[PDB]
Design a protein around this ligand. Structure first.
Ligand code: UDP
Ligand code: NAG
Ligand code: AKG
Ligand code: FE2
Ligand code: MN
Lengths: 706, 568, 19
């Protein structure tokens, strides 16, 4: 029945980093009594775990205990404050300490770090660990006073070898009842025991379990080269994310931009490279973000001459809009590492930019509130969660292989598809992030972060930011966007974006397909029926039509017109036209894909009971000119139904007429530029074309299910 | 509704049917959904006979015999589980689940044919935990069992830090697992159990296309943690065979499983409704099968006879003179004299009456072998642990030794390697054969006529000592040179086999360790009877101490001695 | 692939009786 008021926690932290804050949250979750020592003092030691050190902690505690030199009744427990997160309530810890019954318990470790000679001097242990680790110890105030009063050495001296030499003496060990938790009942060190831990969930809290020994620890000390795995484990234990109550430390600690003051100055950036399709759309989207244009400072570093005309066309709207605008063209011959480095220097050396927010080329932020919510988060680093459409490729990683390369964690597939929500500790982020300017100023003073090695700049940047001890959050609370794919992008066309129908479907449909088409599909009117079994619905937008006619005139070769044919297998056309087929352009397969995906649902909704796989063999574009060829004679089509889509606007470019059905006395006189016609073409509908008068018209025709 | 899914399982059907019938539950509240497919053997008729015989007790029964065809088209062999076989198994399992759901039937135990529910309290104890899918711990002759401990990356078995602590019964109590094969009890009582699907894989499955993992993904993706408990012993199951084996190997494995069940438990009585296909005995290509037995102890003799019958090996049973009951009047008449200055090398006693009786029995057996002109013979004890495929492996080894041609006289079949050292030498052109060395516990030895003649020429009638000590001396490998100096000839050419074909039934200091050959009266007087050596066991087991850099890797391994799958 | 989880779900309620 040990009272909880007699326990005091003593920890050391020269500075205040995110790890110390995490331990603070862990300690206050169970309502502990923690005392901090060496807060703000200069670290008179050196390398924390490279070779040796820790000789200032012992001097600090030697100064400290003098107030409790005779205080027997209470119980004191010492631990690191950078790489330790508590998991259990104080009652369990004190009950376990009472159960053990010794005067002093040390954390057991796998190896002998400081020296190897004294290994045989250790007393034998059956299954548990054998050696002693100075990571933490629990004991009476009198016992710790007696054991550590003898310290008289330099502040740069090591500590674990001192504790080992003290413990190895058998006489004092019997006298002071030194004991080691070999079976990991209280202390569990992750270094060397990485595979014997599994998270054991619960309703409102989490805990860890050692399947080797079937016990639940209270203190974990992820020392050694295991900082990453404890960073991972800190996401859940003990209040991170439970199945009942969502996540934990995610929604508090927000600025919420109060006061009505001008928003903090932001240094936007763009690093267009590996030429990305749909670039002009991205530039025009760079104007509609929800942020005052006087507080944004663009820096656009291009690296391809191919994109030069697009940026040239975009430029004067940008210069008219944001407070400051710059450019670094293809002629400067700068590597991406240099570009990112000089941008980081440019903001770092300007005391006015508080938040350097990078933004790579291919990251479409379909949500326009991203900057607001990110700045509202006030995390030391942060990055929005994005994903390739219809896959698992995201913009972050779960855990790192020993080669510092991509491994696969156990929650990655859960995080990508948004089965859990919060803010997640992550060992690598890319293609979007918001850095707090102070961390640039007095946490990252050195310039060379992206360059200086053979490694890629992003991985090197993360490696540099990791060892300095700054956490890299990732948030997925809302939908932020999606990553495009630039695995292959040919450019030997006037508009090479037209071939992107396979690679990036959503953006292709957004740009080319007529805007109204979805509403027509779901059935709220729009579709017109000027004559029975004849339908009028909008399919294509003006961009598609103008780019298509531009491509066709780029080809220019207006074959066809003679009654015979070489393209036709038979060699005898029913009626000839001045036409350009899609097989010669290389654009036939994409046309078939468009027919399959965007026509079939419409026709299956319009003519209920029909199922169509959308197979086509003949499809072309026809030009009508008053001098070359007139409109067609009455005829019939060798297919179930036909597609008739116009490509230029009547009146403004040509004057003429549409189609003419004999059996219904039907006349189409006003073909629309971006609409499609649907009518059966085998038996019932005898149609003829009206003749053009002035100008030039273009019509796209396809035969489906012949 | 204890259904099943069998294919060519007649090799062990009679015992499995009786074990299933031995369950202590209301027969008016039971059922069966048995079916067979792609069975090349006569398992269909055997199953139909029992189904007709027991058709009255079960509240209902069903069958869909599918004897045609007997094999898959794109099948590598009898043991090949291809994509078509896995798909058929998944479809059959899902059909069994669907039929189990249409009858408003609570709980279902889809136990396969290979498994054998030996204990009677399987369906009585298993359903008492109120679990979603509770599985029984089916033990076996090795590590492999029906309780995996974790999938690493793509359903492959990952040796967790608790599999060994679990299979050894160190901890008792239901512990969750990532997969549970064979004996599952998918209780249809709970509401959440309405989503489990077997045939149609879930759209969110990216692992392999095996049939033992599609159930795991459906179990996990529906939040039904398949617990598993090993509180009490349940039964035994056979280790899987290789992908190019034959049904005879499976039958041998089943027979070995039955023998292992009989090792410490009463024999598994087969079904009464169905018959028993008894086999004909033989001599395994040997000339004589010696068997030393004690008159007082008969349960061990009965077990050995039953094992020989199961092994289809005839035995030339022999008897031994009771050394403990023997007196000096008969002992001195035979001219049996103790060795000069000989005592126990571990305790200090000169000799024992049981040792004298064993030596006399061995001498009589050797004399009988010499008189009969027996070219080869096998001599064993009253307690041994036979290995799987022992008969075929022993016959192949003997045939290879005889065909190659060598002076094999003292080939070792069972020994305790007291010579803790590097690997012994390997004779040329010999498979799994090496030069023998100092060893104890020589209960089994395949001797030849030349070796027996040499032993008779040695004539150690005036020097009595343990046979295990005399044999190493006869092979010119005894550690102490005093015994060799006392001896006169060392012409015996001993040999050893790395794949030991026998082990002691009970180790020293274990359950049922009645050391009749050790605990006996002294050679002289009758008031010196050393009891069982508790502290100084010494010859406990020559396995833990040999778990070191013993090498023995250059010995040519036989095509046999290969089993287990991704699990061991 | 470090520190695998033991995602815990409670037992579902018993299903309704037949009629
Ligand atoms: O710049 C500093 C100054 C001090 N410490 C202290 O060093 C202690 C030991 O560091 P770590 O926990 O990284 O030790 P390891 O067990 O890895 O040697 C931590 O508890 C901190 O209090 C630190 O990490 N960084
Ligand atoms: C889409 O339909 C709406 C209907 O209100 C119309 O106002 C709009 O102009 C259409 N967009 C086009 C034709 O691009
Ligand atoms: O508009 C025309 O001249 C008729 C077009 C037509 O139906 C066709 O080209 O098949
Ligand atoms: Fe037509
Ligand atoms: Mn540490």
């Amino acid at each position: 029945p040990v009272n909880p008021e007699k326990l005091l926690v003593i920890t050391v932290a020269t500075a205040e980093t995110e790890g110390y804050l995490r331990f603070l949250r862990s300690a206050e979750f169970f309502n502990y009594t923690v005392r901090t020592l060496g807060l703000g003092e200069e670290w008179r030691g050196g390398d924390v775990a490279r070779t040796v050190g820790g000789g200032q902690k012992v001097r600090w505690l030697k100064k400290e205990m003098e107030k409790y030199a005779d205080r027997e009744d209470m119980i004191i427990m010492f631990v690191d404050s950078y790489d330790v997160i508590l998991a259990g309530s104080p009652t369990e810890l004190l009950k376990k300490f009472v159960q053990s019954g010794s005067r002093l318990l040390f954390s057991a470790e796998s190896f002998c770090w400081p020296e190897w000679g004294l290994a045989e001097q250790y007393p034998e242990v059956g299954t548990g660990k054998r050696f002693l680790n100075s990571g933490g110890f629990i004991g009476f105030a009198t016992t710790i006073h007696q054991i550590v009063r003898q310290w008289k050495y330099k502040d740069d001296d090591d500590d674990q070898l001192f504790y080992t030499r003290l413990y190895l003496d058998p006489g004092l060990r019997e006298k002071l009842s030194l004991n080691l938790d070999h079976k990991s009942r209280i202390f569990q060190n992750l270094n060397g025991a990485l595979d014997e831990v599994v998270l054991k969930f619960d309703r409102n809290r989490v805990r860890i379990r050692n399947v080797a020994y079937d016990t639940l620890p209270i203190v974990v000390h992820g020392n050694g080269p295991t900082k990453l795995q404890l960073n991972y484990l800190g996401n859940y234990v003990p209040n991170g994310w439970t199945p009942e109550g969502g996540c934990g430390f995610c929604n508090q600690d927000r600025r919420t931009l109060p006061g009505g003051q001008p928003p903090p100055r932001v240094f936007l950036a763009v690093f267009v490279e590996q030429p990305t399709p749909f670039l002009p759309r991205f530039l025009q989207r760079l104007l509609l973000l929800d942020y005052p244009p006087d507080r944004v400072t663009l820096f656009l570093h291009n690296n391809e001459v191919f994109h030069e005309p697009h940026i040239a066309d975009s430029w004067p709207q940008l210069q008219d809009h944001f407070s400051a605008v710059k450019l670094v063209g293809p002629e400067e011959a700068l590597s991406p590492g240099e570009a990112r480095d000089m941008a980081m220097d440019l903001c770092r050396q300007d005391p006015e930019c508080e938040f350097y927010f990078s933004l790579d080329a291919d990251a479409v932020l379909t949500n326009l509130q991203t900057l607001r919510i990110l700045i509202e988060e006030n995390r030391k680093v942060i990055a929005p969660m994005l994903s390739r459409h219809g896959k698992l490729w995201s913009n972050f990683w779960g855990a790192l292989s020993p080669d510092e390369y991509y491994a696969r964690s156990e929650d990655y597939v859960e995080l990508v598809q948004r089965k859990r929500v919060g803010v997640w500790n992550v060992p690598y982020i890319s293609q979007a992030y918001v850095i707090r300017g102070d961390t640039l100023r007095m946490e990252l003073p050195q310039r060379d972060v992206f360059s200086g090695s053979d490694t890629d700049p992003d991985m090197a940047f993360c490696k540099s930011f990791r060892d300095k001890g700054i956490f890299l959050h990732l948030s997925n609370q809302h939908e932020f966007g999606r990553l495009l794919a630039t695995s292959r992008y040919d450019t030997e066309h006037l508009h090479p974006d037209l071939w992107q129908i396979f690679d990036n479907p959503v953006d292709w449909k957004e740009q080319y397909i007529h805007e109204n088409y979805s509403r027509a599909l779901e059935g709220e009117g729009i579709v017109e029926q000027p004559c029975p079994d004849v339908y009028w619905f909008p399919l294509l937008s003006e961009q598609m039509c103008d780019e298509l006619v531009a491509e066709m005139e780029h080809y220019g070769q207006w074959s066809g017109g003679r009654h015979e044919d070489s393209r036709l297998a038979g060699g005898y056309e029913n009626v000839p036209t001045v036409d350009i087929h899609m097989k010669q352009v290389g654009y036939e397969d994409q046309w078939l894909q468009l027919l399959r995906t965007y026509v079939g649902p419409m026709t299956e909704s319009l003519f209920p009971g029909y199922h169509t796989k959308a197979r086509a063999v003949m499809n072309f574009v026809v030009r009508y000119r008053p001098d070359e060829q007139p409109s067609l004679r009455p005829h019939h089509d060798s297919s179930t139904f036909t597609l008739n889509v116009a490509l230029n606007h009547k009146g403004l470019d040509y004057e003429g007429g549409g189609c003419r059905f004999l059996r219904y006395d039907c006349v189409i006189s006003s073909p629309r530029k971006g609409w499609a016609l649907l009518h059966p073409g085998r038996l019932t509908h005898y149609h003829e074309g009206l003749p053009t008068t002035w100008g030039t018209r273009y019509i796209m025709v396809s035969f489906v299910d012949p | 509704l204890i259904a099943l899914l069998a294919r060519n399982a007649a090799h062990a059907l009679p015992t499995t049917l009786g074990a299933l019938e031995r369950l202590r539950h209301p027969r008016e509240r039971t059922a069966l959904w048995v079916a067979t497919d792609h069975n090349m053997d006569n398992t269909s008729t055997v199953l139909r006979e029992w189904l007709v015989a027991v058709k009255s007790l079960y509240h209902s029964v069903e069958w869909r015999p599918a004897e045609e065809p007997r094999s898959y088209p794109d099948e590598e062999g009898p043991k090949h589980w291809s994509d078509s076989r896995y798909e058929h198994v998944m479809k059959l399992r899902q059909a069994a689940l669907k039929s189990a759901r249409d009858m408003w039937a609570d709980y279902i135990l889809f136990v396969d044919a290979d498994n054998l529910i030996l204990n009677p309290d399987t369906l009585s104890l298993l359903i008492a935990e109120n679990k979603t899918v509770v599985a029984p711990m089916l033990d076996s002759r090795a590590a492999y069992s029906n309780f995996w401990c974790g999938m690493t990356s793509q359903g492959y078995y990952k040796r967790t830090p608790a599999y060994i602590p679990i299979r050894k019964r160190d901890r008792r109590g239901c512990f969750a697992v990532p997969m549970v094969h064979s004996t599952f009890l998918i209780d249809l009582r709970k509401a959440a159990s309405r989503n489990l699907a077997f045939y149609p894989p879930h759209p969110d499955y990216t692992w392999s296309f095996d049939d033992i993992i599609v159930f795991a993904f459906s179990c996990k993706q529906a939040e039904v943690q398949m617990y598993v408990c090993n509180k009490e012993e349940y039964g035994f199951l056979p280790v899987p065979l290789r992908a190019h084996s034959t049904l005879q190997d499976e039958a041998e494995s089943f027979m070995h499983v039955q023998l292992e069940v009989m090792v410490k438990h009463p024999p598994a009585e087969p079904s009464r409704f169905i018959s028993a296909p008894t086999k004909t005995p033989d001599k395994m290509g040997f000339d004589e099968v010696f068997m030393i037995n004690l008159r007082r102890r008969q349960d061990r003799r009965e077990r050995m006879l039953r094992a020989l019958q199961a092994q289809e090996i005839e035995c030339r049973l022999v008897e031994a003179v009771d050394g403990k009951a023997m007196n000096t009047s008969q002992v001195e008449a035979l001219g049996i004299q103790m060795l000069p200055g000989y005592r126990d090398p571990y305790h200090g006693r000169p000799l024992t009456k049981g040792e004298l009786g064993c030596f006399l029995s061995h001498y009589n057996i050797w004399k009988e072998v010499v008189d009969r002109g027996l070219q080869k013979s096998l001599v064993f004890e009253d307690d041994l642990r036979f290995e799987i495929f022992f008969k075929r492996r022993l016959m192949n080894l003997m045939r290879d030794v005889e065909r190659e041609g060598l002076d094999w006289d003292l080939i070792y079949v069972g020994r305790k390697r007291m010579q803790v050292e590097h690997p012994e030498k390997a004779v040329p052109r010999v498979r799994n054969l090496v030069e023998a060395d100092y060893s104890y516990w020589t209960l089994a030895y395949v001797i030849s006529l030349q070796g027996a003649r040499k032993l008779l020429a040695a004539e150690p009638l005036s020097k009595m000592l343990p046979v295990d000590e005399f044999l190493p001396v006869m092979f010119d490998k005894h550690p102490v040179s005093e015994y060799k100096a006392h001896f006169s000839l060392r012409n015996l050419h001993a040999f050893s086999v790395e794949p030991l074909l026998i082990y002691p039934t009970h180790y020293t200091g274990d359950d049922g360790y009645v050391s009749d050959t050790e605990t006996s009266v002294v050679w002289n007087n009758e008031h010196v009877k050393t009891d069982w050596d508790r502290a100084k066991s010494q010859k406990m087991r020559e396995q833990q101490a040999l778990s070191r850099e013993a090498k023995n890797s250059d010995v040519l391994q036989s095509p046999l001695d290969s089993a287990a799958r991704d699990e061991l | 692939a470090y520190f695998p989880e033991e995602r815990w779900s409670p037992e579902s309620p018993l299903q309704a009786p037949r009629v």
